[PDB]
Design a protein around this ligand. Structure first.
Ligand SMILES: Nc1ccn([C@@H]2O[C@H](COP(=O)(O)OP(=O)(O)OP(=O)(O)O)[C@@H](O)[C@H]2O)c(=O)n1
Ligand SMILES: [Mg+2]
Lengths: 144, 231, 733, 82, 96
RNA sequence: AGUAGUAACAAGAG
RNA sequence: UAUACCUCUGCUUCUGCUAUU
RNA sequence: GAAUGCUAUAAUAG
């Protein structure tokens, strides 16, 4: 239902085939403005930016002030931070699992593909390994 | 560069255990080899002071079955191990822990030992480090121009004191023989930028993850950065 | 000799090549990840799963040990435990009956240290045990939502500092780098370590027990005149919305909390006394019967050496040596010469925003003190002039200079505000800009020093200036000097002004702080009609309630005597929550609208009730003889504290359909106390003074006239009025 | 007691994986009592950390007189094997 | 919210009408777009260094190419035979 | 049958 | 086949994010 | 005459 409805409000947008996943992608953004009051996903970048500019004017320095904090946080943030999110999806077994396990599986899996970024302890170098893992031709993992 | 040099001079023990010390301080071993060599020498000097120094069950120093040395090598051991060792020693023998991390500790003396290698004068560098410690650790300073400045109570014997000054000049000569002595002389400064580079895949995903009327992400970035959408 | 066993077990564990590789690969960091590793999906309906699982044979899991084996398999035909070992504990499973058995016929363990371990709680109990309960009161309570401390602490520290202290107590070896903190709590570390020494309770518990009484649990709650933790803990029993309960806790109460509340009492007395003729009379009347928790205000003011203007005014009023002694958190001053004029002004700060601050005028001299360091300060409007100090402790000297720099409000101090400084709270509440600027520059000092400027040191006898590092230096901070060298009978006017024996005044009730705030300890007024010191909404409700109560008489007396029943002690209190600069104008308006109803036959009891209270403040008419005209009457407090003339308002509205008056939410029936003609009788008449309805909206007259356009009309001129959405009326003068 | 639905299905194997990590951590906590309270920090091997601590503990247990020669030799010998 | 209401209430022009629209948005999740969330980060981190601008940009980029798993599947049954069976999501278009 | 209600249970497994 | 009138199981037959912390 | 910012296995809200 959600999958249908999401695309039902985007169908008048720009539809194309992802040359990465090979999937059917639909892009409503900067699309034709609605003719009625049926849910519209066709947001206009210009208007989203203009809105944010006014917000930035009304609250001066807040964006960089936050960005600073959010950035300085990430640098301190360890990997174990991920082990506090109930049932996370584990790609190694294609089932949900405890956050702490779902991570462990990924760290153990990554090591086999020569990805030890986790071991450094900070979240950033572990994150680097995730966006790197996409460029691996094959991905190898333990399964009992 | 220093890359090929340290492989010949120092063993993998000293190479790696230093690169761990550098890693914990979060500075690249290759982008600052001057800093690597300093800690390598700093570590190699410390091991020589506690190499053959052994204690018997009676409680007297002797030269080398038996597994209990006279000194305790703190330099090399990771921070949280080093500090555990340092605290464990202080609390056991019953003295206050120094606020700074020590290099060595003599089990017979029951005192902490701070080691320091300098380029100019060893006598000057003794009074420089006396400001921080004062009398928390019994300093033991050395330099490459055959100049030693130990504490009033120095346990280091005549046969021991030589090996240090020998290896100090032996390496200092080997750096001059390879024309790499000049590499350590010149100043080296670099702030370690927190670089997070994107791969090929994720970069492509980003380019297809853009609003309509954009060739690639670079476009969306520069559009957002530059143009003002008032009205 | 536990060490050997561990090493012997490590050899056993390292024979499992799976465990070996886990230990060899998993970093000390990653311990945190693999510790939380389990099969168990998180139980989403535990309330159910428990209720169900309790009906099973063996729901519980023993820890495999010699103690587990002391429990028998069955007792008098009751299966206590099974052979089958739990997946988790790898020990025998058991029924809830097992616990009940152990607690009955189990071995008797050593409960030594327990009380010292769980002292935190035993005190929590001891406070209730050695408490005294007063009377319950039924009446309106305006609860304010504020961030408060939930549990009294042994000593307050940041979580980081707190944790580091706990490490020093329980886990000496695994402490890491020794911090300043270690030395700062050396007494508490040793004290706790000596108390927890002989105990068999698990260190991890002792950790959380210390954490409970060192780490501050500070959360938002709806409170009313009780902020003190030892009150907050009992907040559920202290008050409701519509009832209050007097409760004196036990143990001890802080001199600071005794002080800070003692101020609010005086401020609240003065605030209310100002309205009556002979304020001193009422000020004295209340003050004598004002109790701070269990301690009389007079006794408290006598006992405590410190407090604000109000404290001194009330001290004088009672007859006590007024201490012009002053505080600014850490800094504590005492005036030698000067007179301060607090003017609210828009200050630009270093980060580049405009903050409203109360700036003090005139050149004043104070005896500044900070710990073991003392000094003499001299300041003018937003400029420090000269600061003499002693060479006591290095940090105590360093703090005094920063405190004096901030206190002076120097335009240089405001320039050195670089970074994020919050004057507004996460919940959009006001924080004291001076007390936040004080709090900011105590953390970042090097900015202030560099943003101030230096100059040549003094070359006098015992004067030798100090630089940034607080050492006898050549360059000293612009107007700072270090030296080797470290009342009068007043009377108070009935109108509350402290006059010298010469004639010059030192304080007045016009000089006290306008800011009401939540008293730390419970403030009680042992005179009947204590509600008079209450909040806007409390006073508003209690007043209109008293109007409704005596409406029978008050309405009749109005139809005989004109101004006989305008002067009532309830309406006096009510004036103290009216803005003084509109009080008279409102009375001027209201009395005219009332008299207009009485004389011209057109009555309206709901309006009479609404306006009658305003008719106390001596009337203030316009220069052309006619009264001021109003749409809403704003009162002291939030932007919701106002009475609408034409419509209803968050304080006051009448429902004619039900004949129900609604006051601050509380519903009262006007059935029986209502005239028959009123229902059909329009409101249009009792809305403007000297204005009455003629007909209905006349398009010829045009749009609806404003207060101004109405006030600027010649008698017998028609106009279009709107009472409320969809009630147009044609009103004439 | 833990829901034992897992005993029937092939997921069984995970209990050994758990009770492995459990063994590793539990012992680590016997070496570092602080680990239970505050998060231990280090990018070095757990074994490395555990070894040194036990070495110091043993040495100072011998020097203090909490441990005997027979036991200390066994300690340094057993730790030697690692 | 009590403080917010108090001000926005009292700030109302005298004579003018203050109105509160008790509001709720429909299909909040379905309608909002990742590529908009990408723009938001890019505009919010304008003064942030190159790496952190990019770091933030990933989460939206993943969401703008994300794949939704279709749960367990659909159960088909014969009442006559009293047989039930789960059809896996991969085998949805196996049966007519 | 029934519960229940946009899809399940009315035992499941070796 | 068979053991099986036996044996094991009763959230694990996919339970998320963000606040109140 | 102000502060102190956090960070559950429950429940509620979206
Ligand atoms: N259990 C929930 C409820 C709500 N939400 C979040 O809150 C939003 C608002 O939920 P709601 O108002 O209940 O529904 P809508 O998304 O508005 O859907 P509808 O069009 O049916 O009103 C959701 O989109 C989602 O972002 C959520 O994450 N989890
Ligand atoms: Mg909705």
């Amino acid at each position: 239902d959600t999958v249908i409805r999401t695309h039902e409000y985007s169908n008048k947008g720009k539809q194309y085939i992802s040359d990465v996943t090979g999937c059917t992608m639909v892009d409503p953004t900067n699309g034709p403005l609605p003719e009625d009051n049926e849910p519209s996903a066709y947001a206009q970048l210009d208007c989203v930016l203009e809105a944010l500019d006014r917000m930035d004017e009304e609250h001066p320095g807040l964006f960089q002030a936050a960005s600073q904090n959010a950035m300085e946080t990430l640098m301190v943030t360890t990997v174990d931070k991920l082990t506090q999110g109930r049932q996370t999806f584990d790609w190694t077994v294609c089932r949900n699992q405890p956050a702490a396990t779902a991570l462990n599986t990924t760290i153990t899996s990554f090591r086999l593909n020569d990805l030890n970024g986790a071991d450094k302890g900070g979240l950033i170098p572990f994150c680097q390994d995730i966006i790197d893992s996409l460029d691996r031709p094959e991905m190898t993992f333990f399964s009992v | 560069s220093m890359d090929t040099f340290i492989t010949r001079n120092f063993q993998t023990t000293i190479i790696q255990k230093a690169k761990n010390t550098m890693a914990e301080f979060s500075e690249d071993p290759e982008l600052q080899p001057a800093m690597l060599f300093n800690i390598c020498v700093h570590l190699e000097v410390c091991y020589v002071i506690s190499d053959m120094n052994f204690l018997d069950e009676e409680g007297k120093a002797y030269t080398a079955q038996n597994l209990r040395p006279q000194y305790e090598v703190i330099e090399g051991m990771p921070r949280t191990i080093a500090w555990m060792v340092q605290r464990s020693l202080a609390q056991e023998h019953g003295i206050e822990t120094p606020k700074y991390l020590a290099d060595l500790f003599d089990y017979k003396t029951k005192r902490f030992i701070e080691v320091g290698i300098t380029k100019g004068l060893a006598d000057d560098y003794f009074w420089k480090k006396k400001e921080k410690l004062g009398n928390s650790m019994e300093l033991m300073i050395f330099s490459y121009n055959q100049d030693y400045s130990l504490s009033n109570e120095s346990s280091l014997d005549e046969e021991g004191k030589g090996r240090v000054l020998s290896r100090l000049t032996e390496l200092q000569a080997e750096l001059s023989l390879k024309n790499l002595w000049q590499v350590l002389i010149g100043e080296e400064d670099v702030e370690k930028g927190i670089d997070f580079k994107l791969g090929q895949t994720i970069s492509r995903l980003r380019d297809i993850s853009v609003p309509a009327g954009f060739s690639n992400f670079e476009g969306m970035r520069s559009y957002i950065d530059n143009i003002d959408p008032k009205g | 000799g536990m060490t050997l066993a561990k090493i012997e077990l490590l050899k056993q564990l390292l024979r499992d090549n799976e465990a070996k590789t886990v230990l060899k690969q998993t970093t000390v960091d990653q311990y945190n990840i693999i510790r939380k590793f389990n099969t168990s999906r998180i139980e989403k309906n535990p309330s159910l799963r428990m209720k169900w699982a309790m009906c099973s044979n063996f729901p519980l899991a023993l820890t495999k040990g010699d103690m587990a084996n002391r429990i028998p398999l069955e007792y008098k035909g009751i299966q206590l435990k099974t052979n089958a070992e739990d997946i988790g504990t790898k020990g025998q499973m058991c029924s809830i009956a097992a616990v009940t058995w152990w607690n009955t016929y189990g071995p008797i363990g050593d409960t030594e240290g327990f009380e010292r371990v769980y002292e935190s709680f035993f005190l929590r109990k001891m406070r209730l045990d050695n408490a005294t309960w007063g009377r319950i009161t039924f009446g309106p309570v305006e609860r304010v939502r504020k961030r408060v401390l939930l549990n009294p602490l042994t000593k307050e520290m940041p979580p980081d500092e707190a944790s580091n202290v706990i490490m020093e107590i329980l886990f000496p070896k695994e402490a890491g780098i020794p911090r300043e903190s270690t030395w700062i709590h050396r007494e508490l570390i040793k004290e706790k370590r000596e108390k927890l020494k002989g105990t068999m309770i698990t260190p991890i518990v002792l950790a959380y027990m210390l954490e409970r009484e060192l780490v501050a649990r500070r959360r938002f709650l709806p409170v009313a005149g009780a902020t003190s933790a030892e009150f907050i803990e009992m907040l559920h029993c202290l008050q409701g919305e519509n009832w209050r309960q007097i409760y004196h806790p036990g143990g001890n109460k802080l001199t600071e909390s005794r002080s800070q509340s003692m101020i609010v009492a005086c401020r609240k007395i003065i605030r209310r006394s100002i309205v009556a003729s002979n304020p001193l009379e009422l000020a004295v009347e209340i003050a004598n019967k004002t109790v701070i928790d269990t301690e009389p205000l007079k006794s408290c003011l006598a006992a405590i050496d410190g407090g604000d203007v109000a404290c001194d005014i009330i001290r004088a009023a009672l007859g006590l040596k007024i201490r012009q002694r002053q505080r600014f958190g850490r800094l504590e001053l005492k005036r030698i010469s000067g007179r301060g004029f607090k003017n609210d002004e828009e200050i630009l700060i270093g980060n580049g925003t405009i903050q409203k601050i109360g700036i003090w005028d005139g050149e004043e001299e104070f005896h500044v003190r900070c710990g073991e360091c003392r000094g003499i300060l001299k300041k003018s409007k937003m400029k420090l002039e000269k600061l003499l100090i002693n060479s006591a402790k290095k940090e105590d000297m360093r703090d005094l200079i920063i405190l004096c720099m901030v206190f002076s409000q120097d335009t240089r101090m405001f320039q050195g505000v670089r970074g994020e400084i919050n004057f507004l709270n996460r919940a959009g509440q006001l924080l004291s800009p001076m007390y936040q600027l004080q709090r900011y520059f105590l953390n970042r000092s090097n900015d202030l020093f560099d943003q101030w400027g230096y100059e040549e040191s003094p070359k006098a006898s015992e004067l030798h200036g100090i630089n940034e590092s607080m050492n006898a230096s050549d360059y000293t901070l612009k107007g700072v000097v270090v030296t080797r060298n470290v009342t009068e009978k007043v009377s108070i006017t009935k109108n509350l002004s402290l006059i010298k024996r010469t004639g010059e005044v030192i304080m007045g009730a016009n000089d006290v702080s306008e800011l009401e705030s939540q008293a730390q300890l419970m403030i009680t007024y042992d005179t009947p009609k204590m509600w008079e010191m209450g909040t806007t909404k409390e006073l508003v409700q209690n007043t209109y309630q008293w109007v409704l109560k005596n409406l029978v008489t008050l309405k009749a007396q109005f139809l005989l005597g004109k101004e006989d029943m305008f002067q009532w002690d309830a309406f006096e209190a009510f004036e103290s929550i009216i803005p003084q600069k509109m009080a008279g104008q409102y009375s001027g308006f209201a009395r005219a609208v009332l008299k207009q109803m009485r004389d011209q036959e057109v009555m309206k009891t709901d309006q009479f009730i609404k306006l009658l209270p305003f008719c106390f403040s001596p009337p203030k008419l316009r220069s052309n003889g006619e009264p001021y005209q109003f749409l809403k009457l704003v009162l002291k407090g939030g932007g919701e504290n106002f009475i609408e003339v034409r419509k209803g308002s968050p304080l006051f509205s009448y429902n004619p359909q039900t004949e129900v008056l609604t006051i601050c939410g509380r519903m009262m029936s006007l059935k029986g106390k209502i005239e028959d003609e009123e229902r059909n009788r329009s409101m249009g008449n009792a809305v403007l003074a000297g204005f009455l309805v003629s007909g209905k909206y006349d398009p010829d007259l045009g749009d609806f006239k404003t207060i101004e356009e109405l006030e600027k009309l010649k008698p017998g001129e028609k106009a279009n009025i709107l009472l409320y959405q969809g009630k147009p009326v044609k009103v004439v003068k | 007691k833990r829901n034992r639905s897992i005993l029937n299905t092939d997921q069984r194997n995970m209990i050994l994986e758990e009770q492995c990590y459990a063994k590793c951590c539990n012992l680590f906590e016997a070496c570092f009592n602080s680990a239970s309270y505050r998060k231990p920090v280090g990018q070095h091997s757990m074994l490395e950390a555990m070894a040194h601590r036990l070495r110091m503990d043993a040495r100072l247990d011998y020097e203090s007189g909490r441990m005997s020669k027979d036991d200390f030799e066994k300690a340094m010998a057993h730790l030697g094997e690692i | 919210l009590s403080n917010a209401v108090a001000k926005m209430l009292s700030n109302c022009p005298p004579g003018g009408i203050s109105m509160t629209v008790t509001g709720d948005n429909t299909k909040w999740n379905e309608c909002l777009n990742p590529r908009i969330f990408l723009a938001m980060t890019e505009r919010i981190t304008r003064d942030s260094p190159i790496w952190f601008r990019d770091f933030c940009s990933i989460a939206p980029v993943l969401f703008s190419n994300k794949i939704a798993r279709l749960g367990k599947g659909f159960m088909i049954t014969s009442k006559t035979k009293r047989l039930k069976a789960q059809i896996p999501c991969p085998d949805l278009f196996s049966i007519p």
